[PDB]
Amino acid sequence: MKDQLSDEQKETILKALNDAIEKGPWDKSNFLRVIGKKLIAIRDRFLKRIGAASQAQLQAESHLANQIALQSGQQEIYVSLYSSDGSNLQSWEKIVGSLPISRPIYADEEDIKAILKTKENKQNEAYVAIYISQSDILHLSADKAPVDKLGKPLLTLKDKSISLENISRFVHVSGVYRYSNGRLIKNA
Amino acid sequence: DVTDATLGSVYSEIISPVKDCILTVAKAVSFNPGGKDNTDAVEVLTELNTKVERAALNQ
Numbered sequence: 001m002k003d004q005l006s007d008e009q010k011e012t013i014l015k016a017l018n019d020a021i022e023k024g025p026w027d028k029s030n031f032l033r034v035i036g037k038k039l040i041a042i043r044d045r046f047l048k049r050i051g052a053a054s055q056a057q058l059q060a061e062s063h064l065a066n067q068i069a070l071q072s073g074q075q076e077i078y079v080s081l082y083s084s085d086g087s088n089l090q091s092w093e094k095i096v097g098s099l100p101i102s103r104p105i106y107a108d109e110e111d112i113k114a115i116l117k118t119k120e121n122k123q124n125e126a127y128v129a130i131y132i133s134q135s136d137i138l139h140l141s142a143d144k145a146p147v148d149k150l151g152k153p154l155l156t157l158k159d160k161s162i163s164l165e166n167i168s169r170f171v172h173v174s175g176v177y178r179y180s181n182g183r184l185i186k187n188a
Numbered sequence: 189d190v191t192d193a194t195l196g197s198v199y200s201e202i203i204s205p206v207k208d209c210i211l212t213v214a215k216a217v218s219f220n221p222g223g224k225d226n227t228d229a230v231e232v233l234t235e236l237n238t239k240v241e242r243a244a245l246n247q
Binding site: 002003006010012013017020023024025026032038052053055056 | 225233
């Protein structure tokens with residue numbers, strides 16, 4: 001009666017489900033066939049839960065990672081990205097690899113998503129959250145700081161650093177993704 | 189959105205629907221007792237649940 005499930009328990013349950021689905025009379029009748037689908041949907045639900053374990057954990061941790069970041073001279077930064085083939089969920093991966101510049105960088109996530117909202121294509125636009133060193137930021141006064149197409153300040157970064165290996169999310173219309181590293185991205 | 193499976197989600201999203209299902213197949217059985225297919229289905233559902241419940245309570 002502990003709530004957390006071990007891998008072996010999860011495996012035993014999956015097996016029970018496979019076996020029940022594989023051997024039941026679910027193709028013998030209209031009634032039975034419908035029950036067969038219900039089962040497949042039950043097994044499906046369950047695989048969606050366990051499949052999601054790791055992303056859920058990373059989500060529950062991201063608050064912690066944030067509070068640590070503030071008090072160790074780090075911050076999460078947001079980089080706007082553009083592709084010519086924005087529908088190809090694979091042509092994005094090759095662009096993220098060439099980050100280590102001219103793209104717009106925002107301190108507030110609300111601002112970069114606002115800017116994306118204005119874009120026409122909306123399929124050719126994405127962005128990555130990135131953990132930064134916060135000593136890496138060249139702090140311009142508000143009198144000097146570049147601004148976007150809304151009157152919102154952008155961040156500028158000091159030279160030849162910030163090739164940071166800690167992305168932590170990739171936002172797109174398709175959905176929120178994750179750098180595998182691996183050089184591919186996916187999440188659900 | 190989605191979190192891991194727990195003992196609670198196992199009971200809520202596998203064991204309970206499957207019990208409801210057993211109830212329903214039992215009705216379809218009371219129309220023609222001895223209909224093999226339906227009776228078989230009750231046996232498979234019932235096995236499924238005892239295996240999953242065993243697994244959930246870590247027996």
